[PDB]
Amino acid sequence: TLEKKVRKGIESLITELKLMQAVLSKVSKVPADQLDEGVKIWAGNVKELSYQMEDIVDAFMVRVKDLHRISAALEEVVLQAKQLAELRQRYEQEMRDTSANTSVDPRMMALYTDVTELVGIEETRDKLINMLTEGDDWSKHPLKTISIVGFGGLGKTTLAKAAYDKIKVQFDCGAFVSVSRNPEMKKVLKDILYGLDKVKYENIHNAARDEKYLIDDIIEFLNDKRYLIVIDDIWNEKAWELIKCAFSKKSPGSRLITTTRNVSVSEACCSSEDDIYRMEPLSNDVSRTLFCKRIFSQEEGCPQELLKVSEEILKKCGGVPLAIITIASLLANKGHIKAKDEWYALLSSIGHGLTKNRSLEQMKKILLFSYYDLPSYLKPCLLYLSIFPEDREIRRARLIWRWISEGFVYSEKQDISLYELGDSYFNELVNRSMIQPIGIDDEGKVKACRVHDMVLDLICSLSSEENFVTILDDPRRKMPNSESKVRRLSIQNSKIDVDTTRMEHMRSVTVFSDNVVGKVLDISRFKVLRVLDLEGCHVSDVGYVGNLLHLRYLGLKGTHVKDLPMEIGKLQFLLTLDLRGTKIEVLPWSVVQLRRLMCLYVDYGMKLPSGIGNLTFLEVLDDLGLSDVDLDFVKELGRLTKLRVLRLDFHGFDQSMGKALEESISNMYKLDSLDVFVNRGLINCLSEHWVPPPRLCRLAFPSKRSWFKTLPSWINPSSLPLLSYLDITLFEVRSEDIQLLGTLPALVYLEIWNYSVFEEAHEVEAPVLSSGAALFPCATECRFIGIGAVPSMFPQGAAPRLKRLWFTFPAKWISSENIGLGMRHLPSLQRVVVDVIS
Amino acid sequence: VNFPFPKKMITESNSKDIREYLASTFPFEQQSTILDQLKFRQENLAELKDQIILSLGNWQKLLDYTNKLDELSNTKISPEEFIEEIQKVLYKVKLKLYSQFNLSIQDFALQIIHSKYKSNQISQNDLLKLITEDEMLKILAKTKVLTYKMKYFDSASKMGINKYISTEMMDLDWQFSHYKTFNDALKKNKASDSSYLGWLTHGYSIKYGLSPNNERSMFFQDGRKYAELYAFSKSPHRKIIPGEHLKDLLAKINKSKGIFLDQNALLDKRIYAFHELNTLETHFPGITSSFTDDLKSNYRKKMESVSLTCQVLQEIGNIHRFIESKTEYGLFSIPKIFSIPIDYKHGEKENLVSYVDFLYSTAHERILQDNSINQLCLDPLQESLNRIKSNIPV
Ligand SMILES: Nc1ncnc2c1ncn2[C@@H]1O[C@H](COP(=O)(O)OP(=O)(O)OP(=O)(O)O)[C@@H](O)[C@H]1O
């Protein structure tokens, strides 16, 4: 009855949403200069309305007394939407004669810069020249492409022009052509035509034949010649393939150059990683020389008192030959406007307010190009990076879980894990050349990420003009003029103004390495809260969560938590639960009540209550403590057929129940990585008759004191052909085990331990790779412990890619002839030291 | 009293001046010096149940196993079965007054095996086949630290030597002297297991209050730590190009090294950092070998300089535990039959006060001086020198 009216209004509300995200997606596409103020203000208001109705619908969804409150809220929200309709409609004008000319390219006059100005461009121009002109001799090699990927303004067109100016007289044709964000194909092809001959194709921009006949024309003009075309700033490769067909004929002695800001389109070219040309930030010394070239007259030691300021600031740019140009031109209006005071003001300003200046926005457009080219469902992903402090590494897993908990990841295909979707978002951010990845964690993928400095403050500002985040920093010490409409707060070193009076609708809150938490801030006052992040704090009082209903992310890494309340069962909605590094050693029984979850980063010290098989939706479990456990609970683990990554260590169940779990593992088929830890024992878990899950990639083994008797039979190229990681240790060793392992397809990572050599009186033998020729198409990392791997397993045509190798070498083989090295292998196999044994 | 440095000289024809008395006197029979019998435990084998019968009313298993251990003490049993007989109580008991007698059950039972080995009643290979057992390492590494805090911790705190208790110097104690075989015979055959048992021993030592702290220990109480610890113990090139979970360990050890090299900060956490880093260095050599930092910070000699004071203070505390007893010797350590009366002994005037001067001269001979070290070496040594010269006459 009463609830019926509310529920029938909900679908109207969600349609209203869909319309508003439609229009907001439409408006945000255009840069914030061609937009008139009325549209900007209207969009600003509709965004707040969007937040309000998202709040209402989420509240109704989580709840179903409350019906009347929901009714009043929805009614009033409808009222403001209706009012704002005619508030917009009241003031509109046409102004037929408003045709302001389109803005020019901000980075065009940058192309018109003095040759005798750039420094350090050498020893990279030559390298890029001879990485492609080495085949120019014997100018009959098949044509090839060399792309150039980069980010920001590290300088790609500059070097492309440099190579485009030296080696040219030895060519018949050529064309330097640019492409915008949304090109016109006929425009581009006319551009190529005019760049070849300006006589026959003088007014080639006038005629409008079609996309096809002029392609035929350019194809015809390219017979029996070497062209050497270059096309830059191509985005959305679907454009590239159209031009690609224009180069479809055999032409010995030709080639072409490409530049782009996305690596996810360069691999679409040149068919090989050898032809990809990464470009890197300049060195500290070259950057210092360039910085002092501009501001100073001819020498840098004259100040001798702001030097430390100079290298302190210069590292903020890193190596980018755009920031070190911009700041150099900004900071010296005419010979050091003043000393050491505005430098400190500038250093403080970066991070929160440096962008709003003069003669500086002409540079920020070149960086917002990338942000504007993003599709939807990815702008929030990038703007979420402003929460974390300036210089701190960010683990990708934290980002993925935060995104999913926020609600930025969703689909309607039912064939997606909803987690590898987050991985897809992260990899899409990476391949756009706009996040730096580092490390390779235990998941087999990137460890953590870092953000460029000025890009960080730029996205901070972009999130700042709306209320996407809020930062409390002592150089900033700013609060928006409306305490009410605050959603995301990223508390930092500032520990003074921690007022909490007027944020009823508090989407998310986080604290970074502060003792101000708790003693000044109250979280229980937040009626709603999507995610909570408190890692690194020193408080153990988290027992008010029962008053909270909307948590999804709950991070408590390194928190000194002694215990958590029994009333946690009320959190039916939840996605993650990290408890690593806590003092709690037993979980409450009220986890059976939980229903939704995918990850549980728990430590093996804690105790898992019986009844774990209920968590069907669980998707990844880490460091489970398996000691003194009954058999039914052990078999419960095979119930949930959705888990991908599992980590196990144990000391106290080495019985046949180990085999009971061993076949229970195969009940799952979604695995991709596994590892088992056990102390100095024979492996009484895995049998030789047990089918493995079809998908397996890592299968590590952290223990080194334990051992297998021999190589397991169920390891074969037949089953589990997806391995990229081996990590085995066992007692014996066989010259046939290596031959068996050489048949598996990928095996990127290899690490084998021979227990008997390093624990018993045994001599390192020489295993022989008998069958086959290569057995290792792609094995970059290979480690042999206590096993002799001479360089002469095979000629260089066995392991194309192998950067690292480790093995043991007896001193008695020095006088032998089985160590016959001296040649250079195909991979970078020149950096090696061998553990030699007397 | 601000006693100055006792400048003496220990040269030829002077080491045997006093050690000869030490070669036969009641102390130092189970100890040694840095300048370089079974009836005693049998009487305690009789006194094993001095007070168990008093409060048997729960408290019956104590006496039930007491007479069993008494039977096993004097009866002669083949090595192939004596271990099986003695492990019946070892593998049975799980865990205030109760544990006060439970430890004496375990501690006295294990001393029998070493005593029989000293008499060649147990084959060495048989001992090797049982010391490699996983559980007994955990038993010994727990019972040692429990027994030390049973008796010596009550008197260590009052003297002020509680803050300078180091786990790796525990075998030097006269009571804990049988551990020398368990150490050397084990390291000769399975050297890795020696560092293994030491790594466990310090781990239990941290969380029993020997070296307490409010923050967690990222180096112990986790098997995965020993994975990398043993991985680098074999390949000497796994630390130059380390994998993950090893940059973390380096980041937590070099931070503590900088803490140790610091000057102003609070001293208790220097003590904690020392008792960690020295353990890791002695058990896992070449684990903090920062070849650049140590040379320009004199770290290699600074660690030895601050280490020597611990043995010096241990010997001074031993002398203090000797002077008043002539129970600071510890409960269940000295039987009442072999007890020491209150009368002053004439041999003390020639072999104790003189030996103190020799000890302090040996302490003040090759220790480097640094203001950071002076807070760690000069100040405690001077405090001990002041304290030792205010109690010898009385
Ligand atoms: N060695 C250098 N010395 C001086 N300025 C340099 C140097 N290298 C690059 N620059 C500057 O960097 C900019 C070059 O930009 P770049 O070549 O990256 O442009 P792009 O390929 O069109 O695209 P984007 O800037 O988006 O990557 C210009 O401002 C140029 O003056």
Chain A closest CA to B207's CA: distance in Å? 13
Residues near A816 by beta carbon (within 8 Å), at least 6 away in sequence: none
User: How many other CB atoms are found less than 10 A from the CB of residue B107?
Assistant: 17
Beta strands in A381-476, from DSSP E residues, in sequence order:
394-395, 436-440, 446-450, 471-472
Nearest to A808 by CA among A737, A727, A754, A728: A754
CB of A27 closer than 6 angstroms to any ligand 1 atom: no
CA atoms of A273 and A224, how far apart (whole Å): 29
Rg (CA), chain B: 23
**Burial of A748 from C-beta contacts in 10 A (0-12 / 13-18 / 19+):** middle
The two structure tokens encoding residue B34: 């840095």
Phi-psi region of A36 (alpha: psi -120 to 50; beta: other; left: phi over 0): beta
Closest C-alpha among B285, B306, B303 to residue B294? B303
Instruction: Characterize the bridge pairing of strands A804-806 and A781-785.
Output: parallel
DSSP H or E run through A86: helix A66-89
Technique employed here was: cryo-EM
- Cα torsion A800, A801, A805, A811 to 10°: value is 20
Amino acid letter at A729? T
**Angstrom distance (rounded) from CA A803 to CA A783:** 11
CB of B373 closer than 8 Å to CB of B302: yes
- Does an H or E element contain A330, and which? helix A323-331
Resolution of the entry in angstroms: 3.3
- CA A384, CA A394: separation in Å to the nearest integer? 12
CA distances from A251 to A194, A481, B368 (A): 21, 65, 78
What tokens were used for A35?
């937009």
Verify whether the Cβ–Cβ distance A785 to B234 is below 8 Å: yes
Pairing relationship of beta strands A436-440 and A446-450 according to DSSP bridges? antiparallel
Residue with tokens 């020149």: A830
How many A from CA of A469 to the centre of ligand 1?
Answer: 32
3-state secondary structure of A728: strand
- With a 6 Å cutoff on the Cβ, whether A321 touches ligand 1 is yes
Which of A438, A758, A808 is the best substitution to test chain B (most B C-beta atoms within 10 A)? A758
Sorted by sequence, the CB contacts under 8 Å of residue B58 that are 6+ apart come out as: none
Q: Closest CB to B134: pick one of A442, A680, A785.
A: A680
* Closest to B355 measured CA to CA, from B383, B378, B377, B388: B388
Reference A648, options B225, B224, B199; nearest CA is B224
The continuous run of DSSP H or E covering A453 comes out as helix A453-465
A672 in Cβ contact with A696 (< 8 Å) = yes
Quick one: which of A60, A63, A99, A93 has its CA closest to A77?
A60
Ligand 1, residue A119: give the atom nearest the CA.
1
Token pair listed for B153:
């911790």
Rounded Cα distance, A586 and A603, in Å: 10
State the Cα–Cα distance between residues A642 and A307, nearest whole angstrom. 58
Are A78 and A45 contacting, i.e. CB atoms less than 8 angstroms apart?
no
Give the pair of three-digit tokens for residue A182. Answer: 């949304």
Residue with tokens 């706009």: A434
* Residues contacting A763, CB < 8 A, separation 6+: A757, A810
Backbone angles phi, psi at A464, to 5 degrees: -80, -35
Distances (CA, A) of B205 to A293, A797, B340: 61, 55, 32
Q: How far apart are CA A459 and CA A386, in angstroms?
A: 7
Nearest to B134 among A581, A679, A785 (CB): A679
- Residue A51's Cβ-count burial label (10 Å; 0-12, 13-18, 19+) is middle
Query: Of A701, A670, A671, A705, whose CA–CA distance to A686 is shortest?
Result: A701
CB contact under 8 A, B223 and A581: no
- From the CB of A113, is ligand 1 less than 6 Å away? yes
Q: DSSP string spanning B229-241?
A: HHHHTT-TTTTTS
- Rounded to a whole number of angstroms, the CA Rg of chain A reads 31
Angle at A446 between CA A266 and CA A725, to 5 degrees: 100
Strand pairing category for A394-395 and A446-450: antiparallel
Task: Name every chain A residue with its beta carbon within 8 A of the beta carbon of B234.
Answer: 758, 785-786
**Residue A705 forms contact with B (CB below 8 Å):** yes
SS3 label, residue A218: helix
d(CA A667, CA A680): 28
C-alpha pair distances (Å), A696 with each of A387, A636, A725, A746: 35, 22, 9, 12
Query: Which amino acid is residue A346, in one-letter code?
Result: L
Euclidean distance between CA atoms A264 and A281, whole angstroms: 20
Comparing CA positions, the residue from A134, A165, A127, A169 lying closest to residue A148 is A127
- Number of helices and strands in chain B (H, E): 18, 0
- Residue whose Cα lies nearest atom 2 of ligand 1: it is A118
B344-358 in b/e burial notation, b at 16+ Cβ within 10 A?
eeeebeebbeebbbb
Instruction: State how far residue A808 is from chain B, nearest Cα, in angstroms.
Output: 9
In chain A, after which residues is the C-to-N distance over 2.5 Å, breaking the chain? 64
CA distance A737 to A708: 13
Nearest C-alpha to atom 22 of ligand 1 is from which residue? A157
CA distance A418 to B65: 61
Q: Which residues of B touch A703 (CB under 8 A)?
A: 223, 227
Segment 347-366 of chain A within 8 Å of chain B by CB: none
A639 is in an annotated binding site: no
* Residues sharing a CB contact under 8 Å with residue A381, sequence separation 6 or more, in sequence order: A403, A408, A425, A429
Question: Which amino acid, one-letter code, is at A60?
Answer: F
Judge contact between A696 and A668, C-beta under 8 A: no
B144 close to B170: Cβ distance less than 8 angstroms: yes
Distance (Å, whole) CA B377 – CA B311: 12
**DSSP sequence for A233-258:** S--STHHHHHHHHHS-S--TT--EEE
Cβ proximity of A727 and A703 under 8 Å = no
Q: What is the DSSP string of B323-356?
A: HTT--TT-TTTS-STT---SS--HHHHHHTHHHH
DSSP structural state of residue B163: G
Breaks (C-N over 2.5 A) in chain B follow: 36, 57, 95, 326
CA distances A828 to A791, A799, A823, B208, Å, are: 13, 11, 12, 52
Q: In what order do the strands lie in the sheet with A728-730?
A: A728-730, A749-754, A781-785, A804-806
A370 CA: nearest ligand 1 atom: 26
Partner-chain contact B244 A442, CB within 8 Å: yes
Of B130, B43, B146, residue with least CA distance to B87: B130
With contact defined as beta carbons under 8 Å apart, do A555 and A387 qualify? no
Q: Which residues of B touch A (CB under 8 A)?
A: 134, 216, 223-224, 226-227, 230-231, 234-237, 244
Number of neighbouring beta carbons within 10 Å of residue A487: 18
Q: State phi, psi for A707 to the nearest 5 degrees.
A: -160, 155
Instruction: Please tell me the distance from the alpha carbon of residue B365 to that of residue B346, in angstroms, as a whole number.
Output: 30
Side-chain half-sphere exposure of B348, counting CA atoms within 13 A: 14
Overall size of chain B counted in residues:
394
Q: Which residue bears the tokens 């007491």? A: B66
Strand pairing of A145-149 and A446-450?
A: unpaired
In whole angstroms, what is the distance from residue A367 CA to residue A567 CA?
A: 48
State how far the alpha carbon of A607 is from the alpha carbons of A621, A624, B215, in Å. Answer: 14, 9, 22
For ligand 1, whether the C-beta of A118 sits within 6 Å is yes
- What is the position in ligand 1's atom list of the atom closest to the CA of A286? 1
Assigned token pair, A553: 């992310």
Nearest to residue B196, comparing CAs of B103, B111, B279, B127?
B279
The DSSP result for A246-289, as a single string, is HS-S--TT--EEEEES-HHHHTTSSSSSTT-EE--PPPHHHHHH
Phi/psi at B83 (nearest 5 deg)?
Answer: -65, -40
Orientation of helix B79-90 relative to helix B60-74, angle to 10°: 170
| Rounded Cα gap, residues B116 and B85, in angstroms | 14
d(CA A171, CA A226): 6
Q: Is A327:A355 a contact under the CB 8 Å cutoff?
A: no
DSSP A471: E
Nearest partner of B154 among B331, B379, B377, judged by Cα: B331
Spatial separation of the C-alpha atoms in residues A49 and A233, rounded to whole Å: 38
User: Would strands A808-810 and A835-837 be described as parallel, antiparallel, or unpaired?
Assistant: parallel
Q: Which residues, other chains included, contact A567 with Cβ-Cβ below 8 Å and sequence gap of 6+?
A: A543, A545, A546, A590
Nearest to A735 by CA among A775, A765, A774: A765
Structure tokens at B350: 């020639």
